[PDB]
Amino acid sequence: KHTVRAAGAVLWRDPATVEVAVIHRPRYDDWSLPKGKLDQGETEPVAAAREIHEETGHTAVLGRRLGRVTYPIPQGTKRVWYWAAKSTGGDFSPNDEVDKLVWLPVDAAMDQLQYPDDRKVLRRFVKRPVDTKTVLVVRHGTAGRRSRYKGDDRKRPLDKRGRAQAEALVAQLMAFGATTLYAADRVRCHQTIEPLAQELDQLIHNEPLLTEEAYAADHKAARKRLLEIAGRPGNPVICTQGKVIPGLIEWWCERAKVRPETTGNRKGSTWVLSLSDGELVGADYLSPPDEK
Ligand SMILES: Nc1ncnc2c1ncn2[C@@H]1O[C@H](COP(=O)(O)OP(=O)(O)OP(=O)(O)OP(=O)(O)OP(=O)(O)O)[C@@H](O)[C@H]1O
Ligand SMILES: Nc1ncnc2c1ncn2[C@@H]1O[C@H](COP(=O)(O)OP(=O)(O)OP(=O)(O)O)[C@@H](O)[C@H]1O
Ligand SMILES: [Mn+2]
Ligand SMILES: [Mn+2]
Ligand SMILES: [Mn+2]
C-alpha cells in the first residue's frame, strides 16, 4: 500500500515515422522505457526529464502525458507516469545502469519492449499526434484566505507555502518548454510565475479578461482570449484563479472531444494542454508541486 513514485517517457525523434528509444539494463536483463524514481521535492515531469537525460544522454521537451503503470514491489506499489518526450539532442554512452539504447520505429519497439504495460504506453503514444505545442494553465499558489469583502482581493500575496510552490513550478514548467508568460490581473497570479519570469528573463503579460470577476461578467471574452493566447507562437503559461480554470478546461475538452485522465483544481496545479495544428489533443492535470 505504500506507493513508490516514478516517471518516464516515450522518447522519440524525427505520426508513426518517428523512432522511439528502448533501453537495456544489465541488472534486470530487460528492455524497457526510460524511467526513474522521484527525488525528494521533484514532481513527475521533472523526474521524467531528468531520468531521460541520465539514462539515454538526451535532453528533451515533454508533451502529452501517456498514462500510468503500477506494479507490486517489496516496498508496496511502484507507480510510473509516462510522457511523450521529443529529443532535443544528446549522445548515449553505455554504462552499468543502462548498457544499450536502440532507436526503433514504433512497430519494432513494440516487439523489443518486454513488459505488456510498456507496450500499452507505446499504443497510447501512437493514438494521437506527438509533435504538439503546449499551453500550461496554472492555478496560483497558496495565498492565505479571502477576507469578508465582497468578491475578490486584488493584492493579497502568496503566503510562504505559495512562494515555495512558485519556485518549485520553474522546473516543472521548464520541463514542457514554457516560453511566454501570462497572468490574470491579481498579484497572487503574477507572483506564482515571477520565479519563472526571472529564469526566462521574460515579462509577464497581464490578463484582466481572465480574472474571476471578468469570467463571471463575460465568459465568452475569457474563452476567446484563451484561444488567442494559445494561437500565438511559443508555449504559453497562463496563471489564473479557481473559479476560472475548471470552466475553461471543461469547455475546451468538450468541444474538441478530449478526455482528461485526471481532474482537479488545486492551488499550484497545472493543466498541460497539448495542441496539434491548433486542435486540442490532450488535457493533463498535474498536482501542485508539494502535493502527491
Ligand atoms: N512495467 C513493469 N511491469 C512489471 N514489472 C516491472 C515493470 N518494469 C520493471 N519491472 C520489474 O520490477 C523489478 C524492479 O524494476 P524497476 O521498477 O525498474 O526498479 P528500479 O528501482 O531498479 O528502477 P527505476 O524505477 O527505473 O529507478 P531509477 O532509474 O530511479 O534507479 P537508479 O537508482 O538506477 O537511478 C524488476 O525485476 C523489473 O524487471
Ligand atoms: N469572500 C468571498 N467571496 C467569494 N468567493 C469566495 C470568498 N471566499 C472564498 N471564496 C471561494 O473559495 C475559493 C477559495 O478561496 P481562498 O480564500 O481559499 O483562495 P483564493 O486565493 O481567493 O483563490 P482563487 O484566487 O483561486 O479564487 C475561491 O476560489 C472562491 O471560489
Ligand atoms: Mn530507471
Ligand atoms: Mn535511472
Ligand atoms: Mn534514479
- The 3-class SS string of 111-130 reads HHCCCHHHHHHHHHHHHCCC
Cell of 211: 480574472
Alpha carbons within 13 A on the beta-carbon side of 155: 0
Which of 146, 156, 159, 191 has the most ligand 2 atoms within 8 A of CB, as the residue to mutate? 146
Residue 292: count other Cβ atoms within 10 Å of its Cβ.
Answer: 6
Experimental method reported for this structure: X-ray
Q: Which ligand 2 atom is nearest residue 142's CA?
A: 21
Residue 136's nearest CA partner among 36, 247, 226 is: 226
Long-range contacts of 231-235 (CB under 8 A, 24+ apart): 231/278, 232/180, 234/179, 234/180, 235/133, 235/134, 235/135, 235/136, 235/176, 235/177, 235/178, 235/179, 235/180
**What is the Å distance from ligand 1's center to 55 Cα?**
13
Ligand 1 neighbourhood includes 24 CB (under 6 angstroms): no
Domain ranges in the chain?
Answer: 1-130, 131-292
Strand partners, 104: 20
Residue 243, amino acid: K
Phi first, then psi, for residue 64 (nearest 5°) are -70, 140
- Resolution value, angstrom units: 1.8
